[PDB]
Amino acid sequence: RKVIIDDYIGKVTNSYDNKCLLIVAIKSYLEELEKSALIESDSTVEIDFEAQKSYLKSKGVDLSYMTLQEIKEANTGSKVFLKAKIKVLDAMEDIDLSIEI
Amino acid sequence: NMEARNVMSGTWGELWLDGNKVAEVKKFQAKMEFTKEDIIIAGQMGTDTKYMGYKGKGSITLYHVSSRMHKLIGEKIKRGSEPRFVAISKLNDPDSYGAERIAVKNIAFDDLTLADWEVGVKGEIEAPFTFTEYDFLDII
Amino acid sequence: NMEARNVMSGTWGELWLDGNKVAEVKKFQAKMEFTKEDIIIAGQMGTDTKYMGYKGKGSITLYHVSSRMHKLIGEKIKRGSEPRFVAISKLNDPDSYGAERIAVKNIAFDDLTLADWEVGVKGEIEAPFTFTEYDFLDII
Amino acid sequence: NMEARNVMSGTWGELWLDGNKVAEVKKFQAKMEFTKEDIIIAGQMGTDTKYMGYKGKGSITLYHVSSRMHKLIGEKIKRGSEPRFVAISKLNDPDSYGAERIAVKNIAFDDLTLADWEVGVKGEIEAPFTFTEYDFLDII
Amino acid sequence: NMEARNVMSGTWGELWLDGNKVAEVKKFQAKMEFTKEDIIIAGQMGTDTKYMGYKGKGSITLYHVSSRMHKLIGEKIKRGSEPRFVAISKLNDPDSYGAERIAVKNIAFDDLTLADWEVGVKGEIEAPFTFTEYDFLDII
Amino acid sequence: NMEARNVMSGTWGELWLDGNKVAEVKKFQAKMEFTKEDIIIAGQMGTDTKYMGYKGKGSITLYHVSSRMHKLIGEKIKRGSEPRFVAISKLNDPDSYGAERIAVKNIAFDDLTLADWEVGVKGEIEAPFTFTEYDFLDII
Amino acid sequence: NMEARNVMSGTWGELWLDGNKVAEVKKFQAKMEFTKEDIIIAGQMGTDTKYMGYKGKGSITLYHVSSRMHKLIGEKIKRGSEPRFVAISKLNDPDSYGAERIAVKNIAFDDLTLADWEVGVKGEIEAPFTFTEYDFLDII
Amino acid sequence: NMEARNVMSGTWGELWLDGNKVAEVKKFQAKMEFTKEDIIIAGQMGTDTKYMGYKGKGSITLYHVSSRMHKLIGEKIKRGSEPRFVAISKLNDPDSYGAERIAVKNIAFDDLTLADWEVGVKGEIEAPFTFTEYDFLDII
Amino acid sequence: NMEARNVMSGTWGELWLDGNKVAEVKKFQAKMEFTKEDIIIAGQMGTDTKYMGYKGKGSITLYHVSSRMHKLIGEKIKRGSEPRFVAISKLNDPDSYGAERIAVKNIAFDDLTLADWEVGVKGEIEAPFTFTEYDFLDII
């Protein structure tokens, strides 16, 4: 929240390239969090396809003849939609051992 | 599934060099050459190989619209310092399944072309390079 | 017996790579290069050779429909581990006497092509490889 | 004596391999390469040579009607045993003076082609070999 | 921004050699070849290179209007003294963004062509050279 | 100044060999190949070269009107004596600025062609040579 | 059991010297040379040997990134005190099973390279040594 | 941390001899060879060594621009007095961090090259020497 | 100051032997080897040296145009008298500044080559020698 508020709200134009740059910044922050071993190293960030499609449908444009790649970069006004996938580590609390006599 | 329209066309590519989009681009190519050594194992006729590393190579060809390549490295080369660049290639064909983007890092160029022209011939400049690292972005 | 229609056509082939059928295939080629040493035997003018082993080589060329080749080996190559695959080629021409099928094993690829495009030209990707073993399935 | 019609045509040849007639044959070639060493003799400017031996080489190209070449040597090569064959070539043109026949012995092949096909192209298989001995039968 | 007309054409170039304008010029080319050594660093598969220097090469091709090339170096070469020249190339296309000018210094030529003619063919003379230094003047 | 008509044409040349004019001449070419060694000077990236000498090379091609080349050297070569000749080339085009003449001295020929003919093809003989010295006569 | 991939690669090795990691390592080698005295026993033809001791030898080669070796021993050599070090080598190939780590103790170097460079050549330093004792840490 | 660019290049070095800069320097080398005696200690298998002293050796190679070496020592060698010199070497690569400067004192040359030349070969002079003491000035 | 052209070339040298110019000279070399004794001084680690004298060595290589060396020494060697000669070497490169001329006195040859030839190889003669004194004439 602090990173987004400091440098992105109101200072960039809502284009596809700026969205990609913001995605890169978030991914870089997650990779920085990686080295401290707080979460897992499989984190991915990308455009929230379904939310964007729902918003476009609400605005009235027809998506029957729109390519899947075309929907990603279509205009959304001021709104931006993103999604991520991270895995959070936990401490050792249960242990199983089987010694074969 | 497979159809003729799905094949990507090179007219739809674009290239960013050092964060600046290059509009006068003709072709872009990157490749990785693996290093493998032959190993003969007793009792088997077929030879087997062991992989040891890779080497990256490529080139850029672009129309001679402006003297872009000089301003990058011309003065730095004489002094003895070699710069490293980052290139991004995006291939976005409307017919194909989306687009693929790749970042090629640690690029070092092989040569610099001061002047090349001939009467009755349009000008072109091609520059080969070598790299070490790469990323995958929005692969299909 | 022999007739023109009996000759096989390449349009009727197909290729399975790692258990997944590849539809955008242009050509497939496999070969085995024997190793022979010259030996001169006293009293005979004609030189004779001794067979010592074989080496397997081949290549695959396919249309650039999708980024299939990256997902296989791109991340594994950097880490230092080399994967091995299995390919099956089937050639089934209705006019010829049935079909022949061959399995090529222990395939290791020679290079990886990150990007290759040019304005006004359709995209293609060719990848050479080396193998060690093979089977015969439904040979004519 | 000499006339255009007397020239032999390749359409009229035929080839027997291991006692079985091969009907899908495109071309056949055999040759002997002599080995000669330069010798300089005092008092003479012109260099003279001494003949020491010969090496036999050739190749066969045939339409890919059937998987004949595999059944001969495919399984034997892996085990470590090399077979030897005998080929007979006959060239019988009605216009020329009769026919000439030659037997090429102790044939050992150079490589085996598991698969080779491309879309829109007819299949062909070429196999080079080396030999040691030969006979003359009904030479003109 | 990018447009077809912006591409520079070779018809609009001109070349000054030793302070005298050369009007019968067909093409002019200069290039710098960097010297790089492969370095393998423990723990990384990708090979990296170290830049050590550069070598300059080029050539000039011009119509055989007059015996200009002889008067420069013909008598000096025999005596044992090698001259050094300076060349300036200017490429000024009205459609493109202005003009670029480059001075190539310390030029030493590779060969001298005494005579070259053939019946029914116009005469041309091409001379390659090597250089060491360069300046940028009015680069775009 | 510069105009199309000023370019010299090869049809207007002529050649004197050993004081006798050769009328059946197709082309004549002479060149001087300098010898240069790379020298690396501490503190400078650009490599520099040192000139050490030159080598002369050329060739003559002429129609096979008569057996001129045999009578010159055929008997002398076998005995062990090598002759040296002098050639003069004159290029006189009415449109160009006058004519240029050059004498090439100490010519020694590389080979002798005893016979060369083929059915349906006109005969030609080309002879390469090497020289050491030259003069300038009426240079433009 | 035996596969080509199991062979260790030297790119994956790393070296510690006096507890500080040496990233600029090219090659490492440590060897133990036994001492054996010839013994002849009366009544038997075959000559036999007796083992008496061993001597340890080795060498380290590294790029000339910094002046590491000077600070280690240069000042102490002049005074008369000979330092002793400990080296640790680990060879961890991902394809091979297990990594071997060996400690070499009581090292004494043979020489110090104050300065060595040549124009157009990258710098490298190599230093042989002798040791006395070793130790096994997680051998395969 | 470790990068290919950090490797020092010998092109950027320079040498001072007796306070006069030597611009015609090709390569410089200075080495210190220790003296060690084998010591066998009863009760332990491994042989140990004792350090006793060092001997310094080196050489200088330079182009034959002028007769620098003659004026230094030629006259004094005949009389019987052996001069002693001081050499300073600095290696300053812009890509590497820091430049190392070392002074080599009490130099005595091994030989004097009066004359050495061959046709078609550039001239070079090399001279080995031995020294006694060194000094560190701004090591990395 | 330092330029590539300043390097002396061996093609421009010439040699006088016993007052007669030697035009058939291939290479010349004269060297002075010092004699030094190791001296160990108590209290200091570095070994030092003492200079005692010098020995002169050299060789001359020349083409086999004539029998020059026989007439010089052949008859006197049998009788028992050993002749002594004087050689003068001058190296005058037009590009370099100044020419060095050195006289080598009291020459004694090591061997005489009566005959040495092989078929298809040009003849050459080389003869090493030792000298005692030298002299400087117009050193640079």
Residue numbers in the entry:
A (entry chain V): 254 to 354
B (entry chain M), C (entry chain N), D (entry chain F), E (entry chain A), F (entry chain d), G (entry chain k), ...: 3 to 142
Sentences from the paper on this structure:
Here, we report the atomic structures of an engineered diffocin, a contractile syringe-like molecular machine that kills the Gram-positive bacterium Clostridioides difficile. Captured in one pre-contraction and two post-contraction states, each structure fashions six proteins in the bacteria-targeting baseplate, two proteins in the energy-storing trunk, and a collar linking the sheath with the membrane-penetrating tube. Specific attachment of baseplate tail fibers to receptors on the surface of a target bacterial cell triggers conformational changes of the neighboring baseplate, which leads to reorientation of sheath proteins and contraction of the entire sheath assembly.
CryoEM data processing of the post-contraction diffocin particles resolved two different substates, an apparent transitional state and a final state, which is 2 nm shorter in length. In the transitional state, these sheath layers are partially contracted, as indicated by the gradually decreasing diameter of the hexameric sheath rings from L28 to L32. Consequently, the last few sheath layers still interact with the central tube in the transitional state. The N-terminal domain of the collar subunit binds to the tube, while its C-terminal β-strand extends towards the C-terminal β-hairpin of last sheath, forming a three-β-strand handshake interaction. The insufficient contraction of the sheath and the absence of additional collar-sheath interactions indicate that the transitional state is metastable relative to the final state and has potential for further contraction. However, contraction of the diffocin pauses at collar-proximal sheath layers prior to completion, giving rise to two post-contraction states.
